[PDB]
Scaffold this motif. Sequence first.
Motif, PDB file in Angstrom:
ATOM      1  N   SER A 117     -17.510  -4.367  -5.380  1.00  0.00           N
ATOM      2  CA  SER A 117     -18.969  -4.369  -5.278  1.00  0.00           C
ATOM      3  C   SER A 117     -19.495  -5.668  -5.883  1.00  0.00           C
ATOM      4  N   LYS A 118     -20.809  -5.898  -5.734  1.00  0.00           N
ATOM      5  CA  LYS A 118     -21.436  -7.078  -6.338  1.00  0.00           C
ATOM      6  C   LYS A 118     -21.547  -6.951  -7.851  1.00  0.00           C
ATOM      7  N   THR A 159      -9.155   1.438  -7.188  1.00  0.00           N
ATOM      8  CA  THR A 159     -10.145   0.454  -6.747  1.00  0.00           C
ATOM      9  C   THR A 159     -10.655   0.771  -5.341  1.00  0.00           C
ATOM     10  N   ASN A 160      -9.775   1.278  -4.463  1.00  0.00           N
ATOM     11  CA  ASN A 160     -10.219   1.746  -3.151  1.00  0.00           C
ATOM     12  C   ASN A 160     -11.216   2.890  -3.290  1.00  0.00           C
ATOM     13  N   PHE A 161     -10.940   3.835  -4.197  1.00  0.00           N
ATOM     14  CA  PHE A 161     -11.821   4.982  -4.403  1.00  0.00           C
ATOM     15  C   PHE A 161     -13.176   4.549  -4.950  1.00  0.00           C
ATOM     16  N   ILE A 162     -13.177   3.662  -5.951  1.00  0.00           N
ATOM     17  CA  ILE A 162     -14.418   3.146  -6.528  1.00  0.00           C
ATOM     18  C   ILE A 162     -15.270   2.499  -5.442  1.00  0.00           C
ATOM     19  N   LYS A 163     -14.640   1.684  -4.583  1.00  0.00           N
ATOM     20  CA  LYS A 163     -15.371   1.055  -3.484  1.00  0.00           C
ATOM     21  C   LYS A 163     -15.890   2.082  -2.479  1.00  0.00           C
ATOM     22  N   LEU A 186       8.903   2.736  -3.682  1.00  0.00           N
ATOM     23  CA  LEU A 186       7.462   2.650  -3.484  1.00  0.00           C
ATOM     24  C   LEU A 186       7.102   1.278  -2.921  1.00  0.00           C
ATOM     25  N   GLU A 187       6.482   1.253  -1.742  1.00  0.00           N
ATOM     26  CA  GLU A 187       6.057   0.010  -1.105  1.00  0.00           C
ATOM     27  C   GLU A 187       4.565  -0.193  -1.353  1.00  0.00           C
ATOM     28  N   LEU A 188       4.213  -1.281  -2.040  1.00  0.00           N
ATOM     29  CA  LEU A 188       2.814  -1.559  -2.352  1.00  0.00           C
ATOM     30  C   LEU A 188       2.041  -1.932  -1.090  1.00  0.00           C
ATOM     31  N   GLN A 189       0.866  -1.331  -0.909  1.00  0.00           N
ATOM     32  CA  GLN A 189       0.034  -1.571   0.262  1.00  0.00           C
ATOM     33  C   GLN A 189      -1.187  -2.400  -0.119  1.00  0.00           C
ATOM     34  N   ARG A 190      -1.724  -3.141   0.851  1.00  0.00           N
ATOM     35  CA  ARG A 190      -2.916  -3.940   0.592  1.00  0.00           C
ATOM     36  C   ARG A 190      -4.137  -3.032   0.499  1.00  0.00           C
ATOM     37  N   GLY A 191      -4.892  -3.155  -0.596  1.00  0.00           N
ATOM     38  CA  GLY A 191      -6.138  -2.439  -0.766  1.00  0.00           C
ATOM     39  C   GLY A 191      -7.337  -3.283  -0.362  1.00  0.00           C
ATOM     40  N   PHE A 192      -8.530  -2.726  -0.597  1.00  0.00           N
ATOM     41  CA  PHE A 192      -9.756  -3.482  -0.342  1.00  0.00           C
ATOM     42  C   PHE A 192      -9.855  -4.696  -1.259  1.00  0.00           C
ATOM     43  N   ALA A 193      -9.476  -4.529  -2.527  1.00  0.00           N
ATOM     44  CA  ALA A 193      -9.568  -5.580  -3.528  1.00  0.00           C
ATOM     45  C   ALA A 193      -8.213  -6.048  -4.048  1.00  0.00           C
ATOM     46  N   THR A 194      -7.124  -5.354  -3.712  1.00  0.00           N
ATOM     47  CA  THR A 194      -5.791  -5.661  -4.225  1.00  0.00           C
ATOM     48  C   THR A 194      -4.888  -6.182  -3.111  1.00  0.00           C
ATOM     49  N   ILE A 195      -4.090  -7.205  -3.424  1.00  0.00           N
ATOM     50  CA  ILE A 195      -3.131  -7.776  -2.491  1.00  0.00           C
ATOM     51  C   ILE A 195      -1.782  -7.890  -3.194  1.00  0.00           C
ATOM     52  N   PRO A 196      -0.758  -7.135  -2.780  1.00  0.00           N
ATOM     53  CA  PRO A 196       0.563  -7.246  -3.418  1.00  0.00           C
ATOM     54  C   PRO A 196       1.196  -8.613  -3.197  1.00  0.00           C
ATOM     55  N   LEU A 197       1.810  -9.148  -4.252  1.00  0.00           N
ATOM     56  CA  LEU A 197       2.521 -10.423  -4.181  1.00  0.00           C
ATOM     57  C   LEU A 197       3.983 -10.118  -3.863  1.00  0.00           C
TER      58      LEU A 197
END
Lengths: 294, 90, 833
Positions: free
Chosen positions: C646-647, C697-701, C741-752
């Motif tokens: 969010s802003k 973070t997905n839930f908060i958004k 566990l395979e990390l998935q891309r979220g709205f605000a998170t990007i796995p390295l």
Amino acid sequence: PLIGLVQLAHYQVTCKVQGLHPGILRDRISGTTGHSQGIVLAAVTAAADSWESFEDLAKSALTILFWIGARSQQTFPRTSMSPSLLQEAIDNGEGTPTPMLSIRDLPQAEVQKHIDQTNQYLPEDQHISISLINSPRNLVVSGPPRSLCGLNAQLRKVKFVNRFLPITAPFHSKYLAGAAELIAEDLKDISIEVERLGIPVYDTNTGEDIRQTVTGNVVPALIRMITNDPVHWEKATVFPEATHILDFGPGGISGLGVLTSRNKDGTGVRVILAGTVNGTVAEVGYKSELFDRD
Amino acid sequence: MRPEVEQELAHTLLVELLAYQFASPVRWIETQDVFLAEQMAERIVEIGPADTLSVMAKRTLASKYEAYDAAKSAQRQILCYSKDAKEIYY
Amino acid sequence: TNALGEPVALPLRFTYRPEAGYAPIHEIMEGRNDRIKEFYWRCWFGQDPLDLDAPVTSKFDGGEAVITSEAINEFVHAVGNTGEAFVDRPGKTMYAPMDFAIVVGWKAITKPIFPRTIDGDLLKLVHLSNQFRMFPGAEPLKKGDKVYTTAQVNAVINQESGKMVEVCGTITRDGKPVMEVISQFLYRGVYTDYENTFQRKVETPMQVHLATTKDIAILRSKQWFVLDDVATPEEFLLGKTLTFRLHTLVHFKNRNVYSHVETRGQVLVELPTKEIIQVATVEYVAGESHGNPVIDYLQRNGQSIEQPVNFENPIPLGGKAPLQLRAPASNETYARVSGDYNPIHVSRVFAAYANLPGTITHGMYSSAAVRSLVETWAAENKIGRVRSFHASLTGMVLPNDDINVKLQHVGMVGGRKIIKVEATNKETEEKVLLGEAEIEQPVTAYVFTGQGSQEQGMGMDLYANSPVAREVWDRADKYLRDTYGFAITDIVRNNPKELTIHFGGPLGKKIRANYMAMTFETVAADGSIKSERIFKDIDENTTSYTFRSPNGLLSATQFTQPALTLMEKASFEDMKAKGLVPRDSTFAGHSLGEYSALAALADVMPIESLVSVVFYRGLTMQVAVERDATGRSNYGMCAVNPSRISKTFNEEALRFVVGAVAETTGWLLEIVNYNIANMQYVCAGDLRALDTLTSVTNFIKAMKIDIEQMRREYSPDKVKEELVEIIKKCAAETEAKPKPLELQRGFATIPLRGIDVPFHSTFLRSGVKPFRNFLLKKINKTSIDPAKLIGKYIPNVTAKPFALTKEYFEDVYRLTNSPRIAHVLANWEKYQD
């Protein structure tokens, strides 16, 4: 001063050719005004009554215009420039950067919006503002040439015509507020009493007859109109029931008369360029129409 | 402070900093603040095969220092070794 | 008019001899030069006392001068210069142009021409050249400065064209020297008086390196090489660069031979402390000679401490048009503002008597006028970046002459530009001034980058084309081959998948022992420290081993780290060799790049130590993480962008969420990189914690939860309770996912992807102690120069300029809880004494 002298010379010729002295010609005119420094010549010709008064009134006007130019330039000196800014304006067809930028064929509201956006990134001493409103889509913005370059860089993204004027000080703006005080001191011994003015002389900002709003010496009002007050040219030139307007300003078809003619289109008013012997613009008249006896 | 003492303190401090670095967060926002705000770096060069920190510095400037640089008339040159060769070398 | 506005007369005297009827007028030459000198003195100094017998070796005082806006304005406007810094514009501090040094120094600089020991007709005097030079670190002169000028004669030399006198004036502000002005004057004529001719020369700070006994025997042959501590061994100097600071005073017997060479000064050594001393004096005399063996020797055996990297391509310069200038009518205007009231610039009868074509525009005017172009274009109109400016006055100028100018940038020195200047008269094409400016680059800072930027072939173009870059790689390869059995260049060039080291032979046994000696300490769950060898597979019985990497060995952290750092170092050494780098640039390097920054700018470790450090680092970090039977770790990293939630979601809200996830789940999760404020962070931790953070973070958004609003409306505990229930749900969903566990891309998170070690997290604190012990073996105390670090280095841990103050040590202690820093702090007084 030299632009003043040209206009005085055109007036002198218009009276000499007709065998008038200045008072008679003035008494044939319903009222007058003058775009920025022009207002001084409008005033002194309204004060004129004879060749004898006109001679001293000319000296007076020249003193006024001189000290205005001198102190304005002293109060607001020029400063140096980068190769990039210089050539940027030139390559984009804007001319060399100067403290005054003409913008044509863009509405005042859009110009103001771009000014506000530009000023958000500038300190208050570098703010630019609309200083001349020649028509609803013909405007001039005054301030630091560099700030004006910033405005041009924004305008380029949405681009109407924008070009720097060949003027070396930011007239009709807060940048000459101190200069006005100096000019008033330099001109303390020069007086043009409002009672001298046998015709209406219209304020460049308000459009009101200064004979109703000023008391005594009009010189402080003339200084203010040039240094600080914005020009509202359509207001200044309402000219009730006008049929003819005589342009004594320099530059002929590129001068103030053609601009005024466009503002007056469809209103029954013919503008005659008193300085121009002949021309190709049919919407205006030329110097012959002042003297023709048919 | 005597120079031998300064060299001793510098050696000890440098070794400790490096010893903890890989078990401590990288505070690169504050690092950029030192460069852009405190030290007034008019030009910054990223040594490296890619322009990763040049891109970060660009974003930091646009997001935080644009109005500050305008107020100070500061002009910034962010240059990456693998892109900006004839600039860095003439 | 003189300096006081009064008329002054020059009396020329003649004898009338009617007996000599074909030539009856004879000039009285006796005392003629004294009368001329007295006249010029009255012209420039009015009623100041004239001393014609002042020694040429004395110091000449110009007095105190206060720099005023009016003096600046008239000078600046007279030289026609839109120097914005010099304008007293509203709100702006007002500076003085460097040329103004002549105004404030005039009295000191001109007095040395008057002494009778400098015999010469001032009506025939020509100003040959003037040079300005700012002292290092000295800031521009400004409105309000109080300055004092003193001057000394550097040289009196009889040349074919006349007697040359060189005068050096030093301008001082607040007791410190700010600027030197050197002027050369020429009395036109033929002079054969060598008794008062001398030259003082500050010689180049030279260096000679004594690689061999032979060099030192050569040195100690010299009787003038007077050792100080003579008990200092000859081979104390073996393998040392001696540094030579020397001054030479010569007096002339005639045009071709000295009456006396004198040549003296200091030969210097840097001690292991990095302190410097003299170890020999230079003490040479010749009387007559055909040269000066000391100096002759140094040019043949040694080198200057700085040299110009001159360009092969002279850079054209100017404004947007080629630049042109004009002499005004009134030389008197310049004579006024300058105070050079010299009549030949302004008076017909004096010019006519002096046999001039007319009254001459001052060369100083021309100098200033041209230097305005110099500063405007070569320094972008930025005054302090100009440091020194020379100008030879090679042709004459008169009122209403017209001039063409060209400027070019043609080399580098110590991070400074080298600029040459030519002014020629537009009509005659004759050169009127030749000159030279040295100018600063913008204030530059240096940045080194993290792991992840590596590519196959990186740095190899430099390796081919730059000897210094090649040396960096060759030294690394030699060390790594001798110590660990491989070449890093082979890995960079070919990115091979697999590579075997053979421990055969004596060298192979040593390489194996190095691997056997490699260890890392782990803290067991009971708090006990277990040492574990990195190369568990290798032992005293192992004959060989094989490195392996399916994405290629350049993708393997242990080789990635050396490779990148070497490339960076090689890059920077090439740039340094080309002289592109200013004296005082500050620096930092993002995680791994830090080591490169230190090695590159601070020289804290040699190449051999550097590659050893970053290899060992890569290895230790791989083995510090527990792995399953398929070699996978349960750790990773995610880039997080708060602005994508969010802003209102800021850095604090991110810290709150990350801390709450870590606390609620008990799993490792930490913000480990702070890259861009409110836009780019990196979190490292357990894969479950990173996935739960993604879900939270997905839930908060998705639910549009405003944490900042909640923190204003509710107690921090209540905001935490609501978040804890969301976290528990997300964590249960995470644990229900299939393993691995395979990390998935979220709205605000990007796995390295590809990062399986939680770099920069507190998890790796256990490794600090063994790694410190390794660093102490690789970083020598004597190698440290604090002057390269202090203010200049910024560590990633502190993110502040490096400093040796108690407060800085306290800050480091607060961040690290280091027992060694604590010990230093608890004994701080011992380091202050």
